[PDB]
Structure formats: structure tokens, C-alpha cells
């Protein structure tokens, strides 16, 4: 890998600089290099990894949706034939997106998850695994679509099981996992009732545990609780 010659600490330093510069592709490449050093990631480093790839794939997903909408409109009755270009370019973006997802999934499988023994790290990585299978599912149309969906579900479910046993209901990783798994249910699994039930129960159980928190922990937990409420408002 192109980052093989760079010190771990320098890759992390540069990831932080890339974030400040809003250079998320560079940030992701630096963090990939850091992961590939083979040492476990600290909490801060896990967050750098996730922020980098979230921003890269987020941009690809937004572009894919624009292109998919244009393509769908082209296939409506009365739309003039404009040739293969819209499909080709949507495919191009799609393939690049799938590549990024495969890269992230590859880092998780080799070997972040297997070395992650603490609840906070293991849940964080399993949530990421669910998220990147969910992004693959968003664009899947073939023989493997059901298996991709099930891979996301399985990763999220393992993360939920650990989170419920090992973390308080206000833990931001637990909350963010539940938020995202709820979206999986609504948008991917055609299970809006499950999505709504999960968001509601997660919100209410967090509410009941806020009294245990410092002001700073309260801020962190309530931010994500508000996202749960925002989704519930969208869905009800």
C-alpha cells in the first residue's frame, strides 16, 4: 500500500489535517494506512476512520441518487431516448461506491473486528459493518441482494446484542447503532413498524438514564436522541 512507508503517528496526524482541510478522500487513505499497520485503534482513531469514510461514501451516495433519479425519469413513457450514457455514468459511480464499501468491509474483516474485545470497540466496528453492507444494499439489484441485506442485519444484530448487555442506554455508540439499525429497518428491510418501535424504545430508555450523566455526557446523548425523535417525526 502507498502508505506503507509512512509512520502510524504521521498518518494519524495527516488524517487530522485532511479533516481540517475537508480533504476526506485523503483522510480516508491516511486512516486506511493507519489501520493496515496492524495495531488496534483508539477511540479517537476509530472516529477518524469513520468520519473519513462516512464523508467519502456520503458524497458517492448523494451522487448515485441524483443519477438514479435521472435514469428513472429516462425510463418513463414519453421520455426521449438519450442512449446508454446515464446508465453508464450511474454504473461508474455505483462501482466506485461499491469499491469504497468493500475497502471498509475489508479493513473490518482484516482484522479490526476480530481483535476488538471491549464492548465500545466491537460495537463500533460491527455498527460500521452493518452501515457499509446497508450502503451496498441501497444499490443492489442482483442474485445477492437478499444476502447483502442479511449481512447488514446480522452485523447490526450482533452489535445490538453486545450493546444491550454491556453499555448503558445513553451510550452514544449504542444510540447511534440503534438510530442506524432503525433506518435499516425503514429503508432497506421494508419494516417501518420495526424501525419506529426501535427508535421509540431506544429514545425512551435513554431518557430514563439521562439523570446519571454529567453535563458533557448529557450533551452527547441528547444530540443523538434528537436524531431519533427527528426520524420518528418523519415517519409518524
Amino acid at each position: 500500500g502507498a502508505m506503507g512507508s509512512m509512520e502510524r503517528a504521521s498518518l494519524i496526524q495527516k488524517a487530522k489535517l485532511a479533516e481540517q482541510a475537508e480533504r476526506y478522500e485523503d483522510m480516508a487513505a491516511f486512516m486506511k494506512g493507519a489501520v493496515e499497520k496492524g495495531e488496534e485503534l483508539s477511540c479517537e482513531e476509530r472516529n477518524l476512520l469513520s468520519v473519513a469514510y462516512k464523508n467519502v461514501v456520503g458524497g458517492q451516495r448523494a451522487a448515485w441518487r441524483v443519477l438514479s433519479s435521472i435514469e428513472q425519469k429516462s425510463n418513463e413513457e414519453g421520455s426521449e431516448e438519450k442512449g446508454p450514457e446515464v446508465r453508464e455514468y450511474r454504473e461508474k459511480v455505483e462501482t466506485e461506491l461499491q469499491g469504497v464499501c468493500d475497502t471498509v468491509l475489508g479493513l473490518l474483516d482484516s482484522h479490526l473486528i476480530k481483535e476488538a474485545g471491549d464492548a465500545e470497540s466491537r460495537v463500533f466496528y460491527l455498527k460500521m459493518k452493518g452501515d457499509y453492507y446497508r450502503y451496498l444494499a441501497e444499490v443492489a439489484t442482483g442474485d445477492d441482494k437478499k444476502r447483502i441485506i442479511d449481512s447488514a442485519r446480522s452485523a447490526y444484530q450482533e452489535a445490538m446484542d453486545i450493546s444491550k448487555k454491556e453499555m448503558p442506554p445513553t451510550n452514544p455508540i449504542r444510540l447511534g447503532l440503534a438510530l442506524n439499525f432503525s433506518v435499516f429497518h425503514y429503508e432497506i428491510a421494508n419494516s417501518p413498524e420495526e424501525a419506529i418501535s426501535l427508535a421509540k424504545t431506544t429514545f425512551d430508555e435513554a431518557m430514563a438514564d439521562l439523570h446519571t450523566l454529567s453535563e458533557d455526557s448529557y450533551k452527547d446523548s441528547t444530540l443523538i436522541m434528537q436524531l431519533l425523535r427527528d426520524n420518528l417525526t418523519l415517519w409518524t
Partner: peptide, 5 residues
């Protein structure tokens, strides 16, 4: 589009 983190 719904919120995720």
C-alpha cells in the same frame, strides 16, 4: 432522507 450517524 432520515438521520444516521
Amino acid at each position: 432522507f432520515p438521520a444516521t450517524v
